[PDB]
Design a protein around this ligand. Structure first.
Ligand SMILES: *[C@@H]1O[C@H](CO)[C@@H](O[C@@H]2O[C@H](CO)[C@@H](O)[C@H](O)[C@H]2NC(C)=O)[C@H](O)[C@H]1NC(C)=O
Ligand SMILES: *[C@@H]1O[C@H](CO)[C@@H](O[C@@H]2O[C@H](CO)[C@@H](O)[C@H](O)[C@H]2NC(C)=O)[C@H](O)[C@H]1NC(C)=O
Ligand SMILES: *[C@@H]1O[C@H](CO)[C@@H](O[C@@H]2O[C@H](CO)[C@@H](O)[C@H](O)[C@H]2NC(C)=O)[C@H](O)[C@H]1NC(C)=O
Ligand SMILES: *[C@@H]1O[C@H](CO)[C@@H](O[C@@H]2O[C@H](CO)[C@@H](O)[C@H](O)[C@H]2NC(C)=O)[C@H](O)[C@H]1NC(C)=O
Ligand SMILES: *[C@@H]1O[C@H](CO)[C@@H](O[C@@H]2O[C@H](CO)[C@@H](O)[C@H](O)[C@H]2NC(C)=O)[C@H](O)[C@H]1NC(C)=O
Ligand SMILES: *[C@@H]1O[C@H](CO)[C@@H](O[C@@H]2O[C@H](CO)[C@@H](O)[C@H](O)[C@H]2NC(C)=O)[C@H](O)[C@H]1NC(C)=O
Ligand SMILES: *[C@@H]1O[C@H](CO)[C@@H](O[C@@H]2O[C@H](CO)[C@@H](O)[C@H](O)[C@H]2NC(C)=O)[C@H](O)[C@H]1NC(C)=O
Ligand SMILES: *[C@@H]1O[C@H](CO)[C@@H](O[C@@H]2O[C@H](CO)[C@@H](O)[C@H](O)[C@H]2NC(C)=O)[C@H](O)[C@H]1NC(C)=O
Ligand code: IUM
Ligand code: IUM
Ligand code: IUM
Ligand SMILES: [Ca+2]
Ligand SMILES: [Ca+2]
Ligand SMILES: [Ca+2]
Ligand SMILES: [Ca+2]
Lengths: 237, 235
């Protein structure tokens, strides 16, 4: 006449060519004939109800009601996280195949396969600020777990895929937009370094955002030798 | 008895081959036994009293006194100014060779032939915070009169007779010492701008953080390394 879903229900079986029909909080059921399975109804509340449906009459008739007034606990064999693209979200409400996502997972684990920041990704930590940066993916799981959010407006100059020319940060190519004109460091190493008493006035140089300076200062005049879109390093004596 | 000396009194003579005794204000007399001459006694006041002594009795008798009671005025060909070295100096008392030197003469107004400042000599305004400057001298005169007293220390670098490099003010070579390490301008153009497909530069020696005009054409800044200022050029 009615029944109560066990704290951890799984398999039902409505009596007789009589069909379960479920009003639930979210699509979690997996029905087959008069039988039905509640797959990972974690947090689920509602009712199955075996209703016969005489076909000429066209009316219903509920003959047994499995009921579940109170959310379910966990289970085993129930994943509680899913990849929304390449990002993990803790299924608030599922479910291997019934995750209801809402929020990306913060990070606390170890063995970081790689991080990903402003589009480009980084294994190893040359030249960033810290290495825990952006979305980082652990060794096992195939998706990116949030760790922090640091600007990609690193000090008056911006790291983006839509950029004016390419620095190289870490040992990985990258692209960058000026967001300013005042003097400020560049957050990448130069990409390429084009060249030109013994031999008098010899220098190396590199294209650059107006007023920004790659390390290091001139070995010589001991400062950042900027002109327009370029920076120089002189050798002489 | 007593004789007040004429405004331009110049010669005196005691009578009885009798010595004169010059009780005076400053040394300006020439003596010749019973006679005496007052050489350029401008401002002098005093008395020669023609005293006389007897070998026989020991009687000493003043037989005539000449008094100047009030200072003599400037007189005739008595130059009441004298060079002390090279600096035209006033004559507080007296005239040529009796002159009692006083303060140096200011530049009242005249045709300045040459100035001398910080131990170097200049005839044109080129390169100086002004001109005339320091102490100059007219053509008719032969000594320097004050004009002005600028500091020979220019925004922290000083132009002086000794060390530690030589630069140039106008036509005239000058020599200069640092007085700090803080960045600042040189008060002078450089001595020698030694010079040096490719790139190139000229350079010259300098005080630590001091800079000559001009800024590098290119980087548009004064590029001092340490003792030298550089000037680049690139295609
Ligand atoms: C509710 O969950 C199930 C399982 O994914 C979905 O049912 C399947 O969906 C399509 C069309 O409905 C069929 O091709 C499958 O054979 C269905 N299987 C069963 C047992 O019904 C259902 O569509 C889901 N609906 C949602 C999320 O709106
Ligand atoms: C949810 O999915 C996992 C697999 O992704 C299921 O666990 C596996 O179950 C199989 C049998 O199908 C076992 O032999 C494996 O050892 C399990 N594999 C892993 C990786 O855990 C789990 O049973 C599923 N939940 C259900 C069916 O409710
Ligand atoms: C992925 O790997 C992580 C660790 O690299 C595992 O997660 C840890 O699991 C232990 C116990 O199993 C917990 O104490 C920790 O909270 C987890 N975080 C740690 C220790 O980093 C996990 O086994 C793997 N995830 C799976 C199965 O996909
Ligand atoms: C400018 O470029 C040259 C060659 O491109 C640099 O040469 C390197 O520098 C040091 C000493 O000069 C050598 O030990 C390295 O082996 C050289 N490496 C290469 C790849 O040539 C030179 O140092 C550069 N000068 C700078 C940056 O001031
Ligand atoms: C007045 O007459 C002369 C002018 O210089 C001075 O004569 C000197 O006097 C000293 C003693 O005071 C003698 O020892 C020197 O031999 C003299 N030298 C010369 C060059 O004449 C005299 O002192 C003067 N009186 C003063 C300045 O009060
Ligand atoms: C002081 O010296 C000046 C010279 O600078 C004398 O003035 C001249 O003296 C001559 C005779 O020696 C006179 O005929 C003129 O009056 C002057 N001529 C010139 C060209 O200056 C002056 O005699 C001196 N006075 C003294 C010692 O009392
Ligand atoms: C050189 O020239 C100056 C400037 O002219 C002379 O000054 C003159 O002398 C009188 C007083 O002796 C001043 O009151 C006047 O300003 C000047 N007179 C004239 C006509 O210009 C100065 O005496 C001269 N110095 C010399 C001859 O040594
Ligand atoms: C750097 O030195 C060169 C020669 O050593 C100077 O070249 C002269 O300067 C001007 C403009 O550059 C040319 O018109 C002349 O023809 C050049 N003359 C000679 C003899 O070369 C150059 O001016 C110097 N740049 C500086 C000091 O900034
Ligand atoms: O098992 U039948 O409609
Ligand atoms: O992680 U490392 O050069
Ligand atoms: O990329 U290159 O000379
Ligand atoms: Ca070298
Ligand atoms: Ca007379
Ligand atoms: Ca004075
Ligand atoms: Ca020198």
């Amino acid at each position: 006449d009615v029944v109560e879903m066990d704290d951890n229900f799984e398999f039902g079986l409505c009596p007789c060519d009589a069909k379960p029909i479920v009003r639930g909080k979210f699509n979690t059921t997996l029905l087959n004939g008069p039988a039905f399975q509640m797959v990972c109804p974690i947090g689920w509340t509602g009712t199955v109800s075996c209703t016969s449906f005489n076909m000429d009459t066209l009316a219903t008739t509920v003959v047994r009601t499995y009921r579940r007034s109170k959310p379910f606990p966990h289970r085993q064999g129930c994943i509680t996280q899913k990849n929304l693209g390449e990002d993990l979200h803790n299924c608030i409400l599922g479910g291997n195949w019934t995750c209801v996502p809402g929020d990306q997972l913060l990070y606390k684990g170890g063995s970081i396969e790689s991080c990903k920041w402003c589009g480009y990704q980084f294994k190893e930590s040359e030249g960033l600020p810290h290495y825990p940066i952006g979305k980082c993916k652990l060794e096992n799981e195939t998706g990116y777990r949030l760790v922090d959010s640091t600007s990609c407006n690193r000090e008056g100059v911006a790291i983006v895929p839509q950029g004016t020319l390419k620095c190289k940060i870490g040992k990985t190519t990258v692209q960058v937009i000026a967001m300013d004109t005042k003097l400020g460091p560049m957050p990448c190493r130069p990409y390429e370094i084009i060249s030109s008493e013994k031999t008098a006035c010899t220098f190396n140089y590199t294209k650059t955002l107006k007023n920004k300076y790659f390390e290091p200062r001139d070995s010589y005049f001991q400062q950042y030798m900027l002109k327009g879109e370029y920076q120089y390093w002189f050798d002489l004596e």
